[PDB]
Amino acid sequence: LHVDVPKDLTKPVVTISDEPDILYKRLSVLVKGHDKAVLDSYEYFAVLAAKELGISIKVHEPPRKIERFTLRVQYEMRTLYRCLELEHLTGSTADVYLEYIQRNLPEGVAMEVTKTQLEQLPEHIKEPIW
Amino acid sequence: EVVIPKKKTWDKVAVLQALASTVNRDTTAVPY
Amino acid sequence: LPPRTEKMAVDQDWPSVYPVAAPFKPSAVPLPVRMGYPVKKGVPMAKEGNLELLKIPNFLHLTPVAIKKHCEALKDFCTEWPAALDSDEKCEKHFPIEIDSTDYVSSGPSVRNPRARVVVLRVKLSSLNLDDHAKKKLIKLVGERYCKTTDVLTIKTDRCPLRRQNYDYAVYLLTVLYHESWNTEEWEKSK
Amino acid sequence: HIFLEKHLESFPKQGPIRHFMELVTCGLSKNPYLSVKQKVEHIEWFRNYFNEK
Amino acid sequence: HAPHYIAHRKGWLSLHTGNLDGEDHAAERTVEDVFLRKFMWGTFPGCLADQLVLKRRGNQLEICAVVLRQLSPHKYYFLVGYSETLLSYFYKCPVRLHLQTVPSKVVYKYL
Amino acid sequence: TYTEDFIKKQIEEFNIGKRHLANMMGEDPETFTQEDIDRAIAYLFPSGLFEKRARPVMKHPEQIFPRQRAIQWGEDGRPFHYLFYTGKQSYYSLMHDVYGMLLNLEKHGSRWLIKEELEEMLVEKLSDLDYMQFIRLLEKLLTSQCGAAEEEFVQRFRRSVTLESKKQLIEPVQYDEQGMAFSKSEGKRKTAKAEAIVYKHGSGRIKVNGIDYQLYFPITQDREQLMFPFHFVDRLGKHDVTCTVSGGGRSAQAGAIRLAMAKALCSFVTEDEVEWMRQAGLLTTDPRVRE
RNA sequence: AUGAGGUGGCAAGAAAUGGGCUACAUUUUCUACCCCAGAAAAUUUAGC
Ligand SMILES: [Mg+2]
């Protein structure tokens, strides 16, 4: 568009609630695929998005798994892994980042998100019952 | 001191609406 | 009809051509990309009619320009980590309990996964108000859930169907374990 | 889900039937695949069967 | 290309998470793929130039087919609408179709 | 077949696609290079196919189409080279040059080029006998007092592949907190993996996983295997060893420790003794493993 | 009646050879340990 542009855009309604936000110490995202190149592309996308949102991210590669079987005729299934560990992100940041990267998850790739929420002791355990 | 922020919330399609607002119309394409 | 990549300028807005995940369109992607094992004295096949390029999960909808433009608009949705929590040293001080829960993203009609109900509570016993006898009783009650090397009690709950129910059960288990660790039966005297 | 022993009130309180139904409820309270209604229906079937016999 | 090139030169026509280590419902996805392929080959007779590509993201279901320019475009649109609606109501998921017309079969070699 | 207009059009198509890819990736089109093209194509079209050629590729047209069709005459039909009618103008031009240099001289870890590489450089098919003739002329040139220019000319035809020396890279000497010199090394035998630290000075004490060797290795065969490296170089009772072995069984662990100790000991012996250890089999990883 | 039933029987014998399964020990067996203890008693198949 060189001239015809939207004069204004309706930004979505994001309300600042009164409740306190959830806190995640860690957030491990393990993605599995049959293709190493797709996992490398997804790692690049996820890491760039994490940088652009200010989240602290580290990436490592868990060992691959190979399930072989027979009907001779020998068949194989490869599973390659990429682990993205995010650190010190609140509840809203985690939700928005996860929505983005899960909607952009490529076909043939599965995800397992482990969230480690930080919580205080319950009030009812602080001191013994008398 | 730990100042826990407030849990801001949004509608289900809010993220999609933001991403959509990011992109303009394709001038060389017929409608979607 | 002629492909519309002939009308695409060299300074266009690429994200507007591929807004979302879409299959490879050789008439829309203005690249002379080739793919295929060449035949003897051959070349890799062209894109028009190429099934191999069509089989790739392409990232044309996620380019660095597009990703930055997306992540600039998504900043409105984020909150800030409380700066007082600079490292794990204070995360384990102000928030002793850690709740671990997992979500699973597969492809199919059903979103259900039986493994998402599991909840893991981790708390250091040194962060609980226990005396010598209370700590001894708690350790003997829990058994292998307590790891001596790390001083961590790890209670994993998966009995209930939902995850909120398993979280409530883990909290209840911790409460009752603490209370029965602080309690001395008549019978205890015969150690 | 976890405390289903209030549905054993109409059963014998100290016989072998109490033992068997305690085993049944311990199994049912560890069942993540059933709803509360199905568990109590199992208990009520047990009640009916043992009432007949 | 022969079956022993499926990860060396060829790829997989269907792409889904079912066969990954730890995932479930591989059989159901396989049966779904079988029905999709027979249905599409019976609904576009003599139009399909090559095999379908069946992609799956979340609960979406994309059929990327390569058809010929021999059938009229109006009939193509009618069939696209019909097949999309029928398959969405049969799998209770948002199915979608991405036809690609080719002037004629793209011959690679002569065997 | 590929006409010249056809390849011309592929050249403009490649250049326009290169500018487009520079646009897509946000890089500056002027400096956007071929390695950048490869990286960007790998990102945008990920492919895990094992064959690198089968993967998606965006090359310059000259790199794809061979087009080894050189024009040897102009519009008037006159050939450019004065040896055109021999049919081997490049090869015979080279022979003429070599003969000229031989005449001029008469007035005054590397290998000869292989036949098909000589063909590649001469871009003309040549037989075995003419290749031998050319090599014989080059040898004759070397025999004479070739000057710097002639030496460089022969070096154009000399490849550096021949010869390779097996020298047994030595481990460096580290120093511990107490000021003692030690060297660390690793070894593997079947599924057993061992790491040994050999000190320069000692009394012959070997500790395996914190345990004395005679207690860790009841069987005399394993103790003889551990003795082999130090005995072979006549320094029994002169070094202390602290090793850690994991996996495998009794004999595999003994062999892995033997290898690790030999490789660590190579630091404190002369190079002649290192080579003697190598020729005794003490520094080679045994690759024999179960099917 | 190649359908459905009833009443009795039927339950074999001998070799030469072809093949298969079990136990078969003193360099063994039991206990303790995981290796310095005490008690008990002709063709054929592979080769690398
Ligand atoms: Mg009979």
Swiss-Prot record, chain A:
Gene Ontology, cellular component aspect: mitochondrial inner membrane; mitochondrial matrix; mitochondrial small ribosomal subunit; mitochondrion
Cell location: Mitochondrion
Q: Which domain of life is it from?
A: Eukaryota
Keywords linked to the UniProt accession: Mitochondrion, Ribonucleoprotein, Ribosomal protein
GO biological-process terms attached to the record? mitochondrial translation
Q: How does it assemble?
A: Component of the mitochondrial small ribosomal subunit (mt-SSU). Mature mammalian 55S mitochondrial ribosomes consist of a small (28S) and a large (39S) subunit. The 28S small subunit contains a 12S ribosomal RNA (12S mt-rRNA) and 30 different proteins. The 39S large subunit contains a 16S rRNA (16S mt-rRNA), a copy of mitochondrial valine transfer RNA (mt-tRNA(Val)), which plays an integral structural role, and 52 different proteins.
Its protein name is: Small ribosomal subunit protein uS10m
The gene it comes from is MRPS10
Swiss-Prot record, chain C:
Q: Reply yes or no: does the keyword Ribonucleoprotein apply.
A: yes
Q: What is its main location?
A: mitochondrion
One molecular function GO term is: RNA binding
Listed under GO cellular component are: cytosol; mitochondrial inner membrane; mitochondrial small ribosomal subunit; mitochondrion
GO terms in the biological process aspect are: mitochondrial translation
Q: How does it assemble?
A: Component of the mitochondrial small ribosomal subunit (mt-SSU). Mature mammalian 55S mitochondrial ribosomes consist of a small (28S) and a large (39S) subunit. The 28S small subunit contains a 12S ribosomal RNA (12S mt-rRNA) and 30 different proteins. The 39S large subunit contains a 16S rRNA (16S mt-rRNA), a copy of mitochondrial valine transfer RNA (mt-tRNA(Val)), which plays an integral structural role, and 52 different proteins.
What is the protein's name according to its record?
Answer: Small ribosomal subunit protein mS35
Question: What gene makes this protein?
Answer: MRPS35
Residue window of the full protein shown: 53 to 243 of 323
From Swiss-Prot, chain D:
Q: Which cysteines are joined by disulfide bonds?
A: none
Q: How far does the signal peptide extend, from start to end residue?
A: none
Subcellular localization: Mitochondrion
Subunit comment for this entry? Component of the mitochondrial small ribosomal subunit (mt-SSU). Mature mammalian 55S mitochondrial ribosomes consist of a small (28S) and a large (39S) subunit. The 28S small subunit contains a 12S ribosomal RNA (12S mt-rRNA) and 30 different proteins. The 39S large subunit contains a 16S rRNA (16S mt-rRNA), a copy of mitochondrial valine transfer RNA (mt-tRNA(Val)), which plays an integral structural role, and 52 different proteins.
**So what family is this one in?**
Belongs to the mitochondrion-specific ribosomal protein mS31 family.
In its UniProt entry, what is this protein called? Small ribosomal subunit protein mS31
Species classification: Eukaryota, Metazoa, Chordata, Craniata, Vertebrata
The protein's gene is named: MRPS31
Show which stretch of the intact protein is covered: 331 to 383 of 395
Curated annotation (Swiss-Prot), chain F:
According to the record, the signal peptide region is none
Q: Which keywords accompany this UniProt record?
A: Acetylation, Mitochondrion, Ribonucleoprotein, Ribosomal protein, Transit peptide
Localization per Swiss-Prot or TrEMBL: Mitochondrion
Question: Cellular component terms, GO, for this chain's entry?
Answer: mitochondrial inner membrane; mitochondrial small ribosomal subunit; mitochondrion; nucleolus
A Gene Ontology biological process noted in the UniProt record is: mitochondrial translation
Q: Does the keyword Mitochondrion apply?
A: yes
Q: Which GO terms describe its molecular function?
A: RNA binding; structural constituent of ribosome
Positions where N6-acetyllysine occurs in the chain: K200
The source's domain of life comes to: Eukaryota
Which family does the record claim for this protein?
Belongs to the universal ribosomal protein uS9 family.
Subunit field text: Component of the mitochondrial small ribosomal subunit (mt-SSU). Mature mammalian 55S mitochondrial ribosomes consist of a small (28S) and a large (39S) subunit. The 28S small subunit contains a 12S ribosomal RNA (12S mt-rRNA) and 30 different proteins. The 39S large subunit contains a 16S rRNA (16S mt-rRNA), a copy of mitochondrial valine transfer RNA (mt-tRNA(Val)), which plays an integral structural role, and 52 different proteins.
Protein name (database record): Small ribosomal subunit protein uS9m
Q: Identify the gene encoding this protein.
A: MRPS9
